[PDB]
């Protein structure tokens with residue numbers, strides 16, 4: 001393919017690896033405790049540090065794979081940030097903002113995680129971790145995307161598209177609002193309001209399906225926030241399907257968004273129905289990661305378009 005130094009495809013490999021590790025650090029948090037002394041241990045049995053005799057269990061692998069990914073992340077993120085900065089910036093000026101964002105948020109989630117070991121009883125603060133971890137992953141994802149695009153003459157995704165004002169409103173607005181919905185979700189978890197409402201869409205058989213207790217309000221607030229996000233994405237997708245059919249990155253970008261929002265909602269409903277089976281929890285952290293990734297891709301398009309035009 002390219003006669004340039006073979007070491008370049010290694011920067012692409014590092015990008016893929018780091019993006020993957022950061023995704024693991026994020027979604028892996030749905031399987032292990034993120035607060036208290038049992039932090040790092042499978043959520044179903046907070047005791048994995050110390051007393052137990054047995055080893056090589058499928059739940060022990062999760063715990064090892066998460067702590068390993070979290071440790072190796074510092075090495076990977078710093079290397080990716082530096083290398084991409086040295087090599088990719090000439091073509092993409094955004095490279096530096098991303099390299100920096102990657103480092104800052106990797107450190108912020110590590111900082112918040114360290115504190116969660118002892119202040120995990122503060123749900124309002126603990127609910128900030130996911131969103132931070134989410135941006136840490138999305139920064140590395142977009143950086144990796146630029147790394148690939150930098151080595152192509154006819155770019156696939158990072159193309160100078162014409163983004164109208166309305167579409168910009170939807171993109172930026174949905175991005176910001178999704179982050180808010182992400183907080184309410186994290187708040188449900190760390191406030192233990194996950195199973196306060198056995199039913200869906202309403203709370204339970206009693207009180208007409210309306211919340212009457214703390215945990216029911218948190219649960220219901222999250223669902224209500226999610227519904228609005230869902231509706232907004234439908235409106236945003238319809239505008240793309242109608243006015244951006246000629247700009248396929250936006251057309252398909254939003255259709256994928258529509259699909260990720262659907263899978264997010266469904267896995268959310270299954271968390272409840274399954275009474276928090278961790279497989280659905282894992283899915284619920286994954287699909288929002290995909291959606292947010294696409295929304296951050298859109299933000300890059302706007303950032304470049306506003307620079308160009």
Ligand code: HEM
Pocket residue numbers: 029030130178181182183184185186187188189190193194195200222223226227229230261262264265266267268269271272276281284285288
């Ligand atoms: C489609 C838009 C939705 C988004 C963007 C979203 C996002 C999130 C996020 C980021 C978390 C936090 C996870 C964590 O801190 O490990 C969460 C948790 C949760 N969500 Fe959603 N969510 C959505 C919809 C729903 C729906 C429609 C339901 C249910 C009817 C639901 C039920 C839950 C439950 C029960 C938790 C707590 C899980 C736990 O204790 O680990 N979500 N959500």
Ligand SMILES: CCCCCCCC/C=C\CCCCCCCC(=O)OC[C@H](O)CO
Pocket residue numbers: 001009012013016017148151
């Ligand atoms: C423990 C293991 C650590 C190692 C993990 C390795 C992960 C390899 C992943 C990708 C390789 C990227 C190779 C890039 C090849 C250059 C050509 C290219 O850019 O292909 C792009 C592709 O089609 C898309 O757009």
Ligand SMILES: CCCCCCCC/C=C\CCCCCCCC(=O)OC[C@H](O)CO
Pocket residue numbers: 234237241242245255258259262
């Ligand atoms: C149209 C909006 C429907 C929202 C329903 C939410 C529930 C389905 C969730 C994900 C599937 C997404 C499938 C999107 C199918 C779009 C088909 C399309 O793009 O047809 C356009 C045509 O070629 C030119 O006008």
Ligand SMILES: [Cu+2]
Pocket residue numbers: 192215
């Ligand atoms: Cu309680």
